[PDB]
Amino acid sequence: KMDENEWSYHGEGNKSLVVAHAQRCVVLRFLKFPPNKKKTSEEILQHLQNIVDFGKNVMKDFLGENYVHCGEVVQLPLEFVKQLCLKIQCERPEKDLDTFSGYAMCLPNLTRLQTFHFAEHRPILCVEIKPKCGFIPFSNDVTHEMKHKVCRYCMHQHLKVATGKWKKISKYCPLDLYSGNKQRMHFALRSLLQETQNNLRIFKNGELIYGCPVADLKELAHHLKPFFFPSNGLASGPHCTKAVIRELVHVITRVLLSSSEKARAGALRLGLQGPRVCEASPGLPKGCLLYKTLQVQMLDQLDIEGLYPLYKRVEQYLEEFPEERKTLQIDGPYDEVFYQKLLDLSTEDDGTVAFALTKVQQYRVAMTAKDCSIMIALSPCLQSRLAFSVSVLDLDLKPYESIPHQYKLDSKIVNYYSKTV
Numbered sequence: 001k002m003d004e005n006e007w008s009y010h011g012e013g014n015k016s017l018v019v020a021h022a023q024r025c026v027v028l029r030f031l032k033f034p035p036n037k038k039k040t041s042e043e044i045l046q047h048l049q050n051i052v053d054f055g056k057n058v059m060k061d062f063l064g065e066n067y068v069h070c071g072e073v074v075q076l077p078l079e080f081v082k083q084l085c086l087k088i089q090c091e092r093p094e095k096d097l098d099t100f101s102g103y104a105m106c107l108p109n110l111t112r113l114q115t116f117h118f119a120e121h122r123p124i125l126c127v128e129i130k131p132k133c134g135f136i137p138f139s140n141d142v143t144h145e146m147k148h149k150v151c152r153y154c155m156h157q158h159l160k161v162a163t164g165k166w167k168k169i170s171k172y173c174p175l176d177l178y179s180g181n182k183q184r185m186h187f188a189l190r191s192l193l194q195e196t197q198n199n200l201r202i203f204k205n206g207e208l209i210y211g212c213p214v215a216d217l218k219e220l221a222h223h224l225k226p227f228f229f230p231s232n233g234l235a236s237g238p239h240c241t242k243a244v245i246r247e248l249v250h251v252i253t254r255v256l257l258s259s260s261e262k263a264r265a266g267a268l269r270l271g272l273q274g275p276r277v278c279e280a281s282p283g284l285p286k287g288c289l290l291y292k293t294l295q296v297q298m299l300d301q302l303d304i305e306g307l308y309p310l311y312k313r314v315e316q317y318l319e320e321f322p323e324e325r326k327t328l329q330i331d332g333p334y335d336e337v338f339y340q341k342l343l344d345l346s347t348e349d350d351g352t353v354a355f356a357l358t359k360v361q362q363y364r365v366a367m368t369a370k371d372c373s374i375m376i377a378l379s380p381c382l383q384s385r386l387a388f389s390v391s392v393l394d395l396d397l398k399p400y401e402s403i404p405h406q407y408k409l410d411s412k413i414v415n416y417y418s419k420t421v
């Protein structure tokens with residue numbers, strides 16, 4: 001028996017909606033789809049099963065077993081889904097919700113959990129960061145001038161601000177964060193606090209308390225003092241907002257730079273081609289999650305510019321041989337062989353379709369890693385004496401048909417930014 005009153009609205013990115021249970025530390029993830037065309041009921045089941053099979057097989061090998069969690073696909077009563085949707089409709093921010101299938105993913109609620117223990121903890125603080133792409137493209141295939149010296153995030157800011165999506169430009173550059181420089185990382189996190197956008201959220205015990213009275217720097221610092229300056233009897237005591245936010249920013253930097261005891265044979269060893277600094281504003285440990293995420297982003301070896309020629313070869317082949325879309329395993333299954341196909345890092349274009357297809361798939365995987373989120377969970381545990389857990393969220397492979405749009409959008413981002421100067 002599923003009561004609709006127990007589940008609350010948790011969040012919503014443009015492709016899926018999440019709801020969280022108040023009692024158990026789990027969440028349910030429902031898909032969004034366009035009116036043209038809404039997917040069939042048995043196709044939804046396979047889509048969700050591919051998201052699990054991608055995270056299970058591909059991303060656990062690239063990032064680590066401890067850092068990825070992708071719970072099972074589950075079936076629910078339609079009457080529960082209809083009623084839960086209507087309640088939650090109210091709380092949406094404003095692509096139609098999956099109301100007719102009754103299929104969803106049951107994931108653990110990482111806002112209330114530690115990974116290494118894996119029970120609920122309280123009091124528990126959680127910082128969810130969306131870091132974006134951590135390098136500037138370096139291939140000779142790129143035409144435009146600005147792309148070699150400014151990262152896509154900073155270039156995308158200006159368009160988003162002018163569009164009206166955001167009010168002001170952020171001072172956050174991903175390359176400050178991904179560079180192992182503590183000083184740059186600290187600055188990157190402070191700017192990201194000052195202008196959150198969709199790139200930062202903070203929770204206390206499951207409840208959102210920061211990045212969408214908005215509100216608010218002082219009010220945040222109230223919730224953080226018990227974690228960072230714990231009064232063990234004595235309240236000594238008077239800590240200003242500046243000092244509280246500082247201890248947050250240090251701890252998050254210290255956490256992202258931490259790695260497990262393991263420093264295993266790197267799945268990816270791709271070197272960092274500069275610029276390591278960005279013209280928008282002023283190494284990283286091999287074991288840590290932030291580095292491993294950067295490496296899977298670097299499967300975009302040739303830029304989008306770039307890869308669109310390689311995409312065109314695979315499309316003219318499937319124009320003429322449409323039956324081979326399935327036989328080539330373009331839409332999975334994302335199994336142990338599929339992970340092996342991604343490890344060919346060679347960049348010569350003599351082999352023509354076998355090579356292009358391999359690179360198209362590597363690019364789909366990179367686009368996933370650029371758009372992924374990182375969750376950090378601070379809390380006391382028996383196994384300040386704060387214990388941490390790192391995790392990655394939002395790991396669903398970007399669809400094959402979005403590659404045209406990715407070219408089209410990047411062309412618009414740089415041309416507006418170059419016109420602006």
Ligand SMILES: O=P(O)(O)O[C@@H]1[C@@H](OP(=O)(O)O)[C@H](OP(=O)(O)O)[C@H](O)[C@H](OP(=O)(O)O)[C@H]1OP(=O)(O)O
Nearest residue numbers: 013014015016156198367368370371398402406409
């Ligand atoms: O359009 P882009 O390249 O800026 O990236 C999209 C994001 O834009 P933003 O973070 O606002 O700059 C976009 O963010 P918002 O929906 O605007 O929060 C999504 O993360 C989207 O991912 P998905 O394809 O829905 O999984 C992202 O789409 P993909 O490009 O990853 O397909």
Ligand SMILES: Nc1ncnc2c1ncn2[C@@H]1O[C@H](COP(=O)(O)OP(=O)(O)OP(=O)(O)O)[C@@H](O)[C@H]1O
Nearest residue numbers: 011012013014015016018107108109110111393394
């Ligand atoms: N396992 C989880 N634990 C805690 N919070 C979660 C979990 N899964 C999802 N969320 C929250 O739900 C939000 C929205 O879900 P999600 O990002 O997965 O959907 P999306 O449409 O694919 O997003 P995006 O547009 O960023 O690609 C996330 O930003 C995250 O804060």
Ligand SMILES: [Mg+2]
Nearest residue numbers: 015016394396
């Ligand atoms: Mg998505």
Ligand SMILES: [Mg+2]
Nearest residue numbers: 013373393394
């Ligand atoms: Mg997300």
Ligand SMILES: [Zn+2]
Nearest residue numbers: 151154173278
């Ligand atoms: Zn930048």
Ligand SMILES: [Zn+2]
Nearest residue numbers: 117381382383
């Ligand atoms: Zn514990």
